[PDB]
Amino acid sequence: SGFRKMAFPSGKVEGCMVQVTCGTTTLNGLWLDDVVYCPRHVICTSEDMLNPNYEDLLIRKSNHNFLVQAGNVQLRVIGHSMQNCVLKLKVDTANPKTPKYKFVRIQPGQTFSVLACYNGSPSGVYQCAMRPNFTIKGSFLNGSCGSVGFNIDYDCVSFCYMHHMELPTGVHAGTDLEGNFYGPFVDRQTAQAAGTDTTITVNVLAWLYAAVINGDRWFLNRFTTTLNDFNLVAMKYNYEPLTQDHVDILGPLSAQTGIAVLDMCASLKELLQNGMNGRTILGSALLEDEFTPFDVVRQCSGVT
Amino acid sequence: SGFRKMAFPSGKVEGCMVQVTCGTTTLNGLWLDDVVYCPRHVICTSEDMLNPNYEDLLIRKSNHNFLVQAGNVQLRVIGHSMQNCVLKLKVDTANPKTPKYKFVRIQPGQTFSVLACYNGSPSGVYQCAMRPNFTIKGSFLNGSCGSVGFNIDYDCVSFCYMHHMELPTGVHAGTDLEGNFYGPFVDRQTAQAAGTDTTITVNVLAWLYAAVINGDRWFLNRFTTTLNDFNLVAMKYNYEPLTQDHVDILGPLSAQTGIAVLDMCASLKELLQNGMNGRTILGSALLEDEFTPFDVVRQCSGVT
Ligand SMILES: *CC(=O)c1c(C)c(C(=O)c2ccc(F)cc2)n2ccccc12
Ligand SMILES: *CC(=O)c1c(C)c(C(=O)c2ccc(F)cc2)n2ccccc12
Numbered sequence A, B: 001s002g003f004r005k006m007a008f009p010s011g012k013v014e015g016c017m018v019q020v021t022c023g024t025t026t027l028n029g030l031w032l033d034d035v036v037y038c039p040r041h042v043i044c045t046s047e048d049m050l051n052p053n054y055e056d057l058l059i060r061k062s063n064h065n066f067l068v069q070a071g072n073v074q075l076r077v078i079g080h081s082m083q084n085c086v087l088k089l090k091v092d093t094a095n096p097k098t099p100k101y102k103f104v105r106i107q108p109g110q111t112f113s114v115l116a117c118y119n120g121s122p123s124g125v126y127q128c129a130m131r132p133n134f135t136i137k138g139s140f141l142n143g144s145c146g147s148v149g150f151n152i153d154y155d156c157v158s159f160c161y162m163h164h165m166e167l168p169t170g171v172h173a174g175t176d177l178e179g180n181f182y183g184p185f186v187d188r189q190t191a192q193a194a195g196t197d198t199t200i201t202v203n204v205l206a207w208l209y210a211a212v213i214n215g216d217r218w219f220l221n222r223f224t225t226t227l228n229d230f231n232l233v234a235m236k237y238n239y240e241p242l243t244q245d246h247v248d249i250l251g252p253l254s255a256q257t258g259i260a261v262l263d264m265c266a267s268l269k270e271l272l273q274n275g276m277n278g279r280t281i282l283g284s285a286l287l288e289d290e291f292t293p294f295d296v297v298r299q300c301s302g303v304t
Helices: A052-060 A200-213 A228-238 A244-249 A250-257 A263-272 A293-301 B054-059 B201-213 B227-236 B244-247 B251-257 B261-276 B292-300
Strands: A016-024 A025-032 A033-037 A066-068 A074-075 A077-083 A086-091 A099-104 A110-118 A119-131 A148-153 A154-165 A172-175 B017-022 B025-032 B035-039 B066-070 B073-075 B075-085 B084-089 B100-103 B111-118 B121-127 B150-152 B156-166 B172-175
Touching: A016 A033, A016 A119, A025 A066, A033 A154, A052 A077, A074 A119, A074 A172, A099 B227, A110 A154, A148 B025, A154 B017, A200 A244, A200 A250, A200 A293, A228 A263, A244 A250, A250 A263, B017 B035, B017 B121, B025 B066, B035 B156, B054 B075, B066 B075, B066 B084, B111 B156, B201 B244, B201 B251, B201 B261, B201 B292, B244 B251, B251 B261, B251 B292
Parallel strands: A099 A154, B100 B156
Antiparallel strands: A016 A025, A016 A066, A025 A033, A033 A086, A066 A074, A077 A086, A110 A119, A110 A148, A148 A154, A154 A172, B017 B025, B017 B066, B025 B035, B035 B084, B066 B073, B075 B084, B111 B121, B111 B150, B150 B156, B156 B172
């Protein structure tokens, strides 16, 4: 029993972290096979960060200008290319520690672990979610760029995020491993607004199921609702509209606990209309939305 | 910027996780050099768990009865001994993946990462704290026993916890790596009360500093207090009494922000007396006490 915001073990990803220095800029790289993936803003000085012409800036760079370091050994760059907002540095050595991996682009609401790194060295690991406005709420200082977000399925690491930016709002923006930013964000030092951040309804519901499984039942009530009645309430509180797909994905949790999904929706509706009244759910005083139904099933069943 | 409940990278500890089966019981072991450390309740059947005589039960066990498996290879047990509530299995092979390590017994209020494991395989990593009542609030299902708690200092892993038990209250109890339980807990299937869990005041204060550093300032006020006046308020809310040592440890945070420790104490006193009033601090609706002053300094400075 017990319910915690848990991250995947980070070992497979630690063995891929390298340091990439270009000019005077140092950030993190991801070494998989003979390729180091890193943000393309590594070629930028602070002046050209206001409005960079990456294609023009890259012309002035050669293989020897990209310094890649794995722990203490220098990797030899034999090729370089730009793929959207990531630079791909071909090195002469395949990473001996390369895990089985995939590059996946995730949907908002989905969760992933982040291995925060500085100078190619990992400092910590935390669990977070791709917000519906395509930002993440992480912990990223200067030098953390190139830190990756990922998931694990037994032995295969599914890389989904690469950190590139902090918006003036303190939230984080980044790309998938093909260099495509999540959301409308661009790798430029310009005023970019994050957009309305809504709450991931399917995740709050899953977390309510995890709470019931782990003992917290005070929020359970004698009421039920409909998808349309609940969604009227969801809209009012800036919650994601709940669809039949969401109800389907909550099926295993609904079945395990014996609580129908629309009954849990009525509990959530009352929590939204009345607040917690000074109480907590799984040690939290607010409705947690960074646990997908898959996270709850996995944590309550011990999938290794 | 940004502040997250961050765990240490778990790679160094993943390379130490093994599976230990004794009779029909399977739990996790920690392989460091030629020794596998695991809970001694591995030799127990469910019947003798009510009141085990571990010395008598251990007599009936030989080296060959302890099955140790690292990933897929079987380790050869050439010796076995009981040290308090841990069994120490001497294997014929030193773990090639043994990191630089220490065994430390931690104080309540101190935080550590837990690598939750099942069948010697890691499922996840989370950050938690040794509560003042010597319990931890983790996530541990059946088979998680032998999962360890640890800290990292550059390359040296300081093992502090080994999971042994879940109290009927859903909280967790375990030992240091010498087999000595934190708190008054015994490895028996008997009614054990956890004790009053107080809030770690020095940690809440550190987290308030982290909040100011990261933008959250609404809770800052025009008041100050004294150690004795604040402690009167702390007692009323079951908060740990704040000492001069605590004020000293908050020195670097106090200096960085320019906010004196007793001024932050007055902010905390008002938060305790008036609540959050529907507001949040670092995305939390309650006062977080699982970030030590060292955790805040480390996370706000990027120590790898
Ligand atoms: C994240 C990181 O390590 C980093 C950033 C964000 C910058 C930077 O100045 C910048 C990049 C992108 C952007 F849109 C605005 C500003 N870095 C410069 C030098 C090293 C590391 C970083
Ligand atoms: C934690 C774990 O894997 C485990 C426990 C807790 C027990 C068990 O039955 C027990 C141990 C200690 C105690 F005081 C009461 C009950 N296990 C039995 C078999 C495998 C794993 C575990």
